[PDB]
Symmetry: D2
Subunit: 257 residues, 4 copies
């Protein structure tokens, strides 16, 4: 496969609907060796089952709010892997009120802080902690959304955080690029996941993209997963600092008229 | 003038080189009534002199890190003005190490938090606190930089914060737009100000833009000020959610080759 | 006014609904001296009346399909004005089938050629013919549409031509910038004009922008006109190579969901 | 391979330095069956050798300036293939003076017409002629350049044509998307090819991208080829209307300062 021998750490695999699950499946298919993170003790058994499905027992806790856990993640991983070839950041969070209704109604300093801390800061934070063990041709991938680019109803504070995340892709690409490391995002179309269900009226977004995207269909975690596997691979060695849309072309139209 | 009768509050007027000074001068010329904020007791006398230069004694302290001071700002202003027609957010801050050298070297959770808190969150925070007194045709203006759009050497963590700021312009425009309120940014070219001098190798950016911009010259606070006055006025009643470049066209080229 | 003494040539003033009419009205208000072009002998009397309304008898024929008429335009204008300070290109055309229904159904080599010739090439063509008489601080303005940036139903071949037009703004800005000349576009929201009525289902676009723009209202030729007058003036001396949206913020959202 | 069974027609394979050669090599590796076009009788033997290298004798003349040759191309191809799964448009041309020196100096109506006819119109023209034989999951790919997005020295008239080309990707994606067909571009970094050598000071662009791109290296036809093969494949079934940069991240920075 086109990821033969590549060692890839995946965050964010919460359920079999997770974007990270689709990425994991595609990476394993293409020959990668995988490792996984989780948050919260009650999820240890579930993530362990997922890891086993992908031929791995490499599972580590990491709440990205916590500097100590970020450092311990890579210390733990290093006991197994001398080097890391891929990193998938598939992590986002905002308090419920910050992704519902009017943008200002749900804006507080703490809601802003938390959304940006978990959804944006954590990506370059993981990159920095990983750097001593990154291979020279390593590839780092995050997940963003069109809400970064244009105002989407209810997405609100997450739109600000995704914009900062996409900027971090560019600044990371410069910082890490001379070494040879690539950094990219996929701006995924709407997919029904646990996180997605936190956005007020997500169902309306899903239906609108199905009706108005050029391909007249929503994307799947398999499609995002394949795009992800591509970006993580040497097939994409010419590509860095890129935000690739995998959204059935929806970003490129003015729909619904 | 084209701002006759308009009541405009300006933040960020630190010295006569400040972008806010240029905006103040243009607004006063076009007939606006002005009020000003400052941070730090040692600046009270200086900002009072500036206010007097622009025919006003309306000066208020506001450290945008502090929720209480934000609320007290508008309570104080309200004792003078029943309504507010314009708001100029000309405020940015990042710790020194976060705007020098390598992006990851200067990245910490706290540096990230502070840069985003002061440079991005504070804009919609002021908008929310101002809303009860905003006139229906009020106009809110912030200042951004090209570092939001593309990676610029040393700008680093501020690039992430400006990207979030530009997203906030769009989400603010939606929140406030039905009332009739407009929200925009100017993405200014490099100007030698106190804040600018915090960026490592700012002089190199200044010289490069002078040599490679389409107009082969750097912008001035007078030029940014006039663009600002325009956006704050009813001349611009068709314009919202816009990030207007005032940078001699530099953003639009690939220079230096 | 902020255009005192400025001599500005306006193309495209077909009726009192034309975008160019709004620009003319704003420019005259701000003190400019105006001159006008027209196409087709039956329009001589109408454009002459418009010119008189704006205090001018300077009217010249110019079909931009014709190199000879472009050259004769500036030779004629030069008999009156030693120098030209502003140029408004408010000209677009595509064959009916190229702006209706499916994009490929209406695509032919000739439809493509004509749409790009009249709608895109003509702008830098006028700039080149005008250059010997342009003042050093002259300002050139064209009108574009969001269809350049994203696919809009029915806009079709005009979307390609507007994309080329917006690129021409950038290349013109570089060519003319060292002299001091500025070049910009306004990307206007939908306005019911004669040209607009050629687009299939224009009414649907108009209604959608009214309902989904941040300001919940369509723009007027007065709003576009004021933005235009600003860009043509020394107020905008810091601005070149810019495509400014004047569309009630519509470009910045994902609406209709 | 990930293109097993896919039948792909490639235009533009002129020499072993051509971008199309890199795409051909990657597609063959991944299991595709290939067919090729050429222009000019003196090239028949050369393109036939290339086709043989990729296990094919399917070679057809097509000058995209000529409607009859475009129609005869697909009639000829149809005698061999019932359906077409991929189309690679790797074709660009502008008269020498239109890609050298000052933008206006090299602008004529005919230079404009020719550059847009061959470099932009020809892509949707091929798509339209191919449509009756396109499979439902076919993928169409064109090659663009950063000169579409920002002004690059000497690229001049080609910048306008590439902007129109990128718009055509979006309008094609909408037209063909309901059927299931995807349409994308790769915006490639500078590569020394025969066409590239027509651009004045191409060597300077090549050197600048090597020094200032995030990866500090120029891209190769192998890297562009792999990205191309990906986009042509079912791996990319979630991706349409996309302009993917394969340029070592150069587009994403402000370099040379
Ligand atoms: N589902 C969509 O439509 C969609 C579209 C575009 C982008 N995205 C993005 O994709 C990414 C993945 O989300 P998803 O849609 O697969 O939903 P998901 O709920 O399956 O995954 C979200 C993950 O974020 C993790 N997370 C939250 N807080 C964390 C913390 N403090 N530390 C570590 N991990 C934490 C969760 O544990 C979870 O695994 C997110 O960044 C999301 O913003 C999703
Ligand atoms: N000078 C440039 O080249 C340039 C270019 C683009 C954008 N900008 C932006 O313009 C804005 C103004 O900066 P400037 O260049 O005029 O420099 P400046 O130093 O004159 O102004 C910066 C202002 O930020 C204020 N500020 C910092 N922390 C604050 C806080 N906690 N509470 C309230 N105010 C605070 C400072 O007091 C100061 O008045 C900034 O947002 C800056 O990012 C500047
Ligand atoms: N009305 C809108 O919603 C809208 C929105 C965005 C952009 N625009 C653009 O604004 C510009 C003006 O159009 P309008 O909406 O004011 O409609 P309009 O019909 O009033 O003006 C169009 C003008 O194009 C001129 N024209 C056409 N072919 C010409 C030729 N061969 N030579 C010289 N002039 C020629 C017409 O004479 C007419 O004056 C156009 O470029 C149009 O694309 C319009
Ligand atoms: N080389 C680069 O740096 C670079 C970067 C970005 C984009 N591109 C684009 O990639 C594409 C391929 O060019 P290349 O760099 O591989 O150089 P190339 O010279 O190898 O290929 C150009 C091809 O265009 C074909 N062509 C020209 N006129 C034609 C016509 N009338 N009919 C049919 N074919 C015609 C030529 O025959 C040739 O095969 C072009 O569109 C070019 O603009 C090149
Ligand atoms: C509408 C598409 C979409 C769905 C889910 C997402 O993940 C989230 C959402 C909110 C908070 C945290 C993560 C996301 O970013 C975008
Ligand atoms: C290079 C142009 C530029 C100069 C000054 C700025 O203001 C700052 C800079 C750093 C931290 C806080 C504010 C800015 O944003 C951009
Ligand atoms: C939908 C807004 C809009 C309306 C009118 C326009 O002018 C045209 C339209 C078609 C052909 C020529 C000029 C235009 O460009 C955009
Ligand atoms: C600088 C990168 C680059 C090199 C070659 C290209 O192909 C051309 C160039 C000019 C005319 C026609 C095709 C191109 O488009 C872009």
């Amino acid at each position: 496969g086109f990821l033969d021998g590549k060692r890839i750490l995946l965050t964010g695999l919460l359920s079999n609907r997770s974007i990270a699950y689709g990425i994991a499946k595609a990476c394993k298919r293409e020959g990668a060796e995988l490792a996984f993170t989780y948050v919260g003790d009650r999820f240890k058994d579930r993530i362990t089952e997922f890891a086993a499905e992908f031929g791995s027992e490499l599972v580590f806790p990491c709440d990205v709010a916590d500097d100590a856990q970020i450092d311990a993640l890579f210390a733990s991983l290093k006991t197994h892997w001398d080097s890391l070839d891929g990193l998938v950041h598939s992590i986002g969070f905002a308090p419920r009120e910050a992704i519902a209704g009017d943008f200002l109604d749900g804006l507080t300093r703490e809601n802003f802080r938390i959304a940006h801390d978990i959804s944006a800061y954590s990506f370059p934070a993981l990159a920095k902690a990983a750097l001593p063990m990154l291979s020279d041709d390593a590839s780092l991938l995050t997940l963003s959304y069109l809400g970064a680019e244009r105002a989407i109803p209810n997405y609100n504070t997450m739109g600000l955080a995704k914009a900062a995340l996409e900027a971090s892709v560019r600044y990371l690409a410069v910082s890490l690029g001379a070494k040879g490391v690539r950094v990219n995002a996929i701006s995924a179309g709407p997919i029904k996941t646990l996180a997605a269900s936190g956005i007020k009226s997500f169902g309306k977004i899903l239906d609108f993209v199905e009706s108005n995207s050029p391909l007249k269909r929503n994307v799947t975690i398999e499609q995002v997963g394949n795009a992800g596997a591509f970006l993580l691979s040497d097939l994409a060695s010419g590509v860095t600092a890129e935000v690739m849309h995998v959204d059935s072309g929806f970003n490129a139209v003015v729909g619904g008229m």
